[PDB]
Ligand binder design. Structure first.
Ligand SMILES: NC(=O)C1=CN([C@@H]2O[C@H](COP(=O)(O)OP(=O)(O)OC[C@H]3O[C@@H](n4cnc5c(N)ncnc54)[C@H](OP(=O)(O)O)[C@@H]3O)[C@@H](O)[C@H]2O)C=CC1
Ligand SMILES: NC(=O)C1=CN([C@@H]2O[C@H](COP(=O)(O)OP(=O)(O)OC[C@H]3O[C@@H](n4cnc5c(N)ncnc54)[C@H](OP(=O)(O)O)[C@@H]3O)[C@@H](O)[C@H]2O)C=CC1
Ligand SMILES: NC(=O)C1=CN([C@@H]2O[C@H](COP(=O)(O)OP(=O)(O)OC[C@H]3O[C@@H](n4cnc5c(N)ncnc54)[C@H](OP(=O)(O)O)[C@@H]3O)[C@@H](O)[C@H]2O)C=CC1
Ligand SMILES: NC(=O)C1=CN([C@@H]2O[C@H](COP(=O)(O)OP(=O)(O)OC[C@H]3O[C@@H](n4cnc5c(N)ncnc54)[C@H](OP(=O)(O)O)[C@@H]3O)[C@@H](O)[C@H]2O)C=CC1
Ligand SMILES: Nc1cc(N)nc(N)n1
Ligand SMILES: Nc1cc(N)nc(N)n1
Ligand SMILES: Nc1cc(N)nc(N)n1
Ligand SMILES: Nc1cc(N)nc(N)n1
Lengths: 251, 250, 249, 251
């Protein structure tokens, strides 16, 4: 049978491009969403028109809470229910906003920023592993090429992305005996935030050495496709920067 | 007037050595503790006998919860109540235990303890310290092995990576206030009290520089340097104090 | 119409596997070699049998010396002479042996370990850029660069210098459309001279599979980085190490 | 009996400040110099006025060449002949100028890779060969906090400074059994060229989060003094950034 993948935050932007490219590669896909039901279903409709019964949607809030472990177990379960297997987990869903150190409650911001970017990937990783040859099992975490030169006033976001690097490495070591590889893709500037102004976006584009433009979502997805492929069978614990050289540029 | 410091998890082991060395350098200290009340009170008594009214204790659970922000605000308030200022914060308190990915505490309690103590509480204490504000600095106790982690310690490792992120992000953001933010990263220092001697010696034998763990004082010496005037231009730096351990391959 | 690639130290082992996989991908290839003339000519014969006029050999010593720039210029020139273009450079050739700090001359060790692993890549990069679509350079790095083998100081210095070159050249050549990336093996093909017991010792250290990477696994990462699927990637070093660099002492 | 230190490139700027602070700490010093003989002698005379017979000069070109190993052996020998011991080596001397990818290039290699990396390596060999519980032996290499966000067109300089990181780590591992520690100090923006226009200096100063100014040579020297002290006796293989946060600043 075809392998199956879960992509979190898959209704739009980078997660959608990842789901599309996995599907084009021959995967059946679980399209996870929180608020974007109409977009999730629109994508599933598009993929199922290409190949019947090869895409399902799955709703969950990935904010940390007392119920997050059960939510994460249910996302993994949805893949096994639809497809009978779950070969690939892509932890793409992410909250992103500033949290100044000097003046939503701060503890809500913790639950969102550290929940979506680190704790939910951790719980999904546990559930994915618990449910596990010619198999090619792997997890890809969407990281951030600027983790070591962070945006001003983004402490909690940066802490969450750092925690995700730690998860990538710890899980790669711990799951290697099961043949599960765990890797990351770290975009620099890709699709800019919808809310961001045009002038601010051009400011970011101009800093990129390679072509003075942001990565398309498809360019990010290309690195994910490589890491889940048979061409990456010895690669685990690696984080591939896809940033056009941005992280190499000094202040 | 003498400067004052908050040290978290200061009743025993490395946090006590830090509080003692700060005290010996001339600081007044807040000795934070969670469960180790007798040890905390014993240390404050020793320091106060050395120079009166130079040490207080402050109790707090640093597990993450909706009241953790108020707890962290209260630890910093305790320093200002006792001493009228707060010059230095050392984020030392830490939970440390395995959380295997494949199979008493629920996973959400493990998250609240391992990520709370190692990362969120340092973050909220950093916010409270900065909000209340000369040689001001914060020192975070990091881990030199963050990129070659112990098997089955994923949540602990996530929390220490988050602490690196806080160290860098806060150094950038608080530099305009003249608050420096740095880290000290031990390799093997005081082994866990529950560990048997044979298992302790396994760890000792790994260390290139002398095949022994760091003393608590050796860790404290790096903290003392980073809060001193000899580190006035240093911010966002994490000093490994690991005897070469992190350079040793498999 | 076919693009062309230079691979250094391409007669045997990982460089051979990279030359073969590039050729299978559609590249014309310059097979650089130093001493392995028979193996180099054998490979070119094999590739030319598959598609005529798609492989040549090029001999050069990559030890540092005052004529190394000319030698590196000549390797790049050989690609233009044979194929009229040079799209890809793979810096694979490398000397590897211990240089203990406490007791060939040391100056020869420096010329060989720093020359092959760092200075020749730099001069090849210069000549590649000066002579100039999907242009790219791939440097073979070492995943163990921050947990070095005991008594391999000069080797480790050369591989750290190569990381520096990868990043510096990525920045400097980005405006010309040339991407510069690295692939960092952990343990791949073990040295021919190493005993079976030591080989097994290294294999047992690797989390993912308890075995070394095949040369083909390393080549597969090189293929990705030169491909259209990596056209926004520059300055990146991909570890291909089965988790080895994550394992504590 | 007083310990002794070799400082390379000690006639001016950072190396001068290191030599002065070591002398103030109680060390006898070898002031290595290449071209600045007048300044090296002037420093030796100042230090000897403070305490007789505590400073000597040693001239050597640290460009790589057939004779560089002999030169580096001589520098260490000079400390033993003057003072009967050599406790500390500070590899401070450094060439710094652009080498665009698009003086012969082999001269540039000899100067940039020889000063910044090969001479430190040969000095390290000579230091260790001479030592083959009051003792506190250590080497401090002057590294660069911006090594992973390099200046445009400085490839050979950056390669040399990355090689020096490798030396620091490799030598820490290998010399640990002899009780020799090996560490680094990595400045960001420190003493700028006096001839550099103040407009350009200000461009660099405004980049630095902590104080919007460059480090003094004394601030760099303070980190060296810590690393060679009794307070750093478990520290080996560590590189301390002294950069005011500059390396954390994104493009
Ligand atoms: N875009 C860029 O430039 C960069 C991206 N990255 C990383 O790449 C990945 C994708 O980035 P991008 O496409 O911009 O991401 P977005 O900011 O567009 O967020 C992706 C999705 O995450 C989901 N999400 C947000 N909060 C929650 C929550 N509480 N519960 C569940 N799902 C949630 C949302 O799904 P829904 O819409 O269904 O509510 C959202 O559509 C992320 O991990 C990001 O950090 C890293 C660096 C730069
Ligand atoms: N020891 C070592 O070898 C290493 C240490 N480090 C780091 O150095 C620092 C000191 O290490 P060490 O002395 O071994 O630390 P310990 O494990 O001894 O813990 C220090 C203190 O943390 C406090 N703590 C634990 N959980 C909580 C909580 N929920 N709320 C509040 N306080 C809490 C405890 O206070 P109480 O006793 O009052 O309950 C404890 O005494 C830590 O950050 C550690 O991660 C890093 C690498 C190795
Ligand atoms: N094998 C492994 O486990 C690992 C490999 N790597 C890196 O991967 C790359 C390939 O590794 P591997 O295949 O083992 O390499 P080898 O050790 O097999 O060397 C590759 C080739 O380099 C050439 N070479 C050596 N010295 C010189 C010189 N003075 N002038 C010119 N060429 C020279 C030789 O060519 P000839 O035979 O023609 O004389 C040799 O065949 C290297 O850069 C290596 O550092 C990194 C980590 C681990
Ligand atoms: N200044 C800064 O902002 C920064 C400095 N650093 C590092 O800190 C250290 C000190 O910096 P700084 O004081 O500015 O250094 P300088 O550029 O002033 O150079 C120091 C000395 O190196 C010596 N030197 C140069 N070339 C040779 C050679 N061929 N042979 C022997 N000695 C030579 C020269 O000695 P002489 O005058 O006797 O000929 C020179 O005075 C260096 O390693 C530097 O890379 C790192 C980052 C930034
Ligand atoms: N770094 C980013 C950017 C962005 N636009 N969205 C997320 N979730 N993370
Ligand atoms: N890394 C460690 C070791 C230890 N013994 N305790 C804590 N909190 N952290
Ligand atoms: N050149 C080489 C050969 C080899 N066998 N291993 C390494 N790291 N490099
Ligand atoms: N990084 C630098 C700056 C500078 N002025 N001199 C040297 N040798 N290195």
């Amino acid at each position: 049978e075809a392998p199956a993948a879960v992509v979190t935050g898959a209704a739009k932007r980078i997660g959608r491009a990842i789901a599309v490219k996995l599907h084009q590669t021959g995967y059946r896909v679980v399209i996870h969403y929180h608020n974007s039901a109409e977009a999730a279903v629109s994508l599933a409709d598009e993929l199922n028109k290409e190949r019947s019964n090869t895409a399902v949607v799955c709703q969950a809030d990935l904010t940390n809470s007392n119920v997050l472990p059960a939510s994460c177990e249910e996302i993994i379960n949805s893949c096994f229910r639809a497809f009978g297997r779950c070969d690939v987990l892509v932890n793409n869903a992410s909250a992103f906003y500033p949290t100044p150190l000097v003046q939503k409650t701060v503890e809500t911001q913790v639950a969102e920023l550290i929940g979506t970017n680190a704790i939910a990937p951790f719980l999904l990783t546990m559930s994915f592993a618990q449910r596990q040859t010619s198999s090619n099992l792997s997890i890809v975490n969407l990281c951030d090429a600027m983790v070591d030169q962070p945006c001003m006033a983004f402490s909690l976001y940066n802490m969450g992305k750092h925690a995700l690097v730690g998860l990538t490495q710890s899980a790669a070591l711990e799951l290697a005996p099961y043949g599960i590889r765990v890797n990351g893709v770290a975009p620099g500037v890709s699709l800019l935030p919808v809310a961001m102004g045009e002038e601010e976006k051009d400011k970011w584009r101009r800093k990129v050495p390679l072509g003075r433009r942001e990565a398309s979502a498809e360019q990010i997805a290309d690195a994910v496709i490589f890491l889940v492929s048979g061409s990456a069978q010895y690669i685990t614990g690696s984080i591939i920067k896809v940033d056009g050289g941005l992280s190499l540029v000094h202040a």
